Amino acid sequence: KVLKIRYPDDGEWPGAPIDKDGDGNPEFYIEINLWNILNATGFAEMTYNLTSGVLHYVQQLDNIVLRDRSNWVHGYPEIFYGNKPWNANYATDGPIPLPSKVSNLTDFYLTISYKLEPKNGLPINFAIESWLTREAWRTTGINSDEQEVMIWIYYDGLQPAGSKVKEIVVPIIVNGTPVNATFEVWKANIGWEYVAFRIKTPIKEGTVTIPYGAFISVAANISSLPNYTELYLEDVEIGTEFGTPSTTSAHLEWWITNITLTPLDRPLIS
Numbered sequence: 044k045v046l047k048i049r050y051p052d053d054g055e056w057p058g059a060p061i062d063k064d065g066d067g068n069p070e071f072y073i074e075i076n077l078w079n080i081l082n083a084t085g086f087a088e089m090t091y092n093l094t095s096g097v098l099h100y101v102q103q104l105d106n107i108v109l110r111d112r113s114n115w116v117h118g119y120p121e122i123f124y125g126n127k128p129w130n131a132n133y134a135t136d137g138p139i140p141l142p143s144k145v146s147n148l149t150d151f152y153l154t155i156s157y158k159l160e161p162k163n164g165l166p167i168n169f170a171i172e173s174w175l176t177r178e179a180w181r182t183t184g185i186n187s188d189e190q191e192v193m194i195w196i197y198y199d200g201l202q203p204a205g206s207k208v209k210e211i212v213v214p215i216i217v218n219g220t221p222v223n224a225t226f227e228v229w230k231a232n233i234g235w236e237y238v239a240f241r242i243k244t245p246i247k248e249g250t251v252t253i254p255y256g257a258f259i260s261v262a263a264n265i266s267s268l269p270n271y272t273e274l275y276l277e278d279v280e281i282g283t284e285f286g287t288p289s290t291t292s293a294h295l296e297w298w299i300t301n302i303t304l305t306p307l308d309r310p311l312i313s
């Protein structure tokens with residue numbers, strides 16, 4: 044009834060599938076993903092109560108030494124749907140067929156109910172991201188003709204990579220009320236093309252619905268990549284990046300009670 048992963052007990056890369064019907068196809072996949080931490084004291088723990096429906100992340104890390112300061116953040120504990128293209132983990136038991144080529148995909152809403160509690164001014168975000176790859180089922184990383192898209196609905200003390208391009212309006216739902224929100228658009232070349240959308244009014248808790256195609260359509264429009272609509276939307280990842288090169292302790296807790304992807308009857312890109 045309860046799934047738990049823990050760093051450092053489970054190794055360098057704790058992770059597990061959420062497979063509530065035990066059918067061998069996960070609905071979601073969880074990872075602690077401390078990808079830029081070389082060593083730390085303390086622990087990080089992610090639990091998922093299958094019975095009550097709550098994901099709870101608890102982190103108390105100290106003595107943090109990074110693998111590369113130039114990566115800036117320490118890690119990205121997360122839950123995702125689809126095929127994460129950095130490893131052999133995947134979750135495909137859901138209504139949206141990911142991976143699929145962006146030219147063939149439905150638009151969809153993403154709704155998340157959550158609460159964030161970073162401690163002591165820890166720099167964090169709450170970021171949704173997707174990777175867009177040239178092959179359908181990538182498991183060995185990302186190339187320079189591919190894209191990373193993030194959507195930050197909370198942040199404190201972090202800025203996206205690269206340069207600010209523009210601001211856009213995206214209609215979202217916040218705590219049940221539809222509302223025009225503003226997103227900053229940022230773009231970088233970091234070994235692949237990176238496009239980030241950073242809300243101008245961060246939301247530290249509640250229920251938020253976003254239209255995924257509004258973001259992928261702007262990412263397509265501003266891209267420098269050839270043949271963009273041939274790329275595959277591999278996954279949708281939801282997690283909190285945290286830390287800076289100056290951060291040596293990182294205590295954080297969060298909860299997610301619901302993630303829903305709702306297909307629409309319209310193309311992703313418009």
Ligand SMILES: OC[C@H]1O[C@@H](O[C@H]2[C@H](O)[C@@H](O)[C@H](O[C@@H]3[C@@H](O)[C@H](O[C@H]4[C@H](O)[C@@H](O)[C@H](O)O[C@@H]4CO)O[C@H](CO)[C@H]3O)O[C@@H]2CO)[C@H](O)[C@@H](O)[C@@H]1O
Pocket residue numbers: 056058074076078116118119129130131132191233237284
């Ligand atoms: O699963 C076990 C296998 O793990 C392999 O290592 C993987 C690791 O699982 C995976 O989680 C890691 O992914 C990170 C990716 O989350 C991160 O994304 C960044 C992004 O680059 C950055 O631009 C944006 O700002 O933030 C994102 C979130 O913080 O990117 C880094 C690459 O820079 C990824 O490392 O990828 C690992 C491989 O690099 C082990 O290799 C394997 O042995 C093991 O069996």
Ligand SMILES: [Ca+2]
Pocket residue numbers: 061062063064065066067068069070136
């Ligand atoms: Ca399943």
Ligand SMILES: [Ca+2]
Pocket residue numbers: 126127128129130131132133181182
């Ligand atoms: Ca994978």
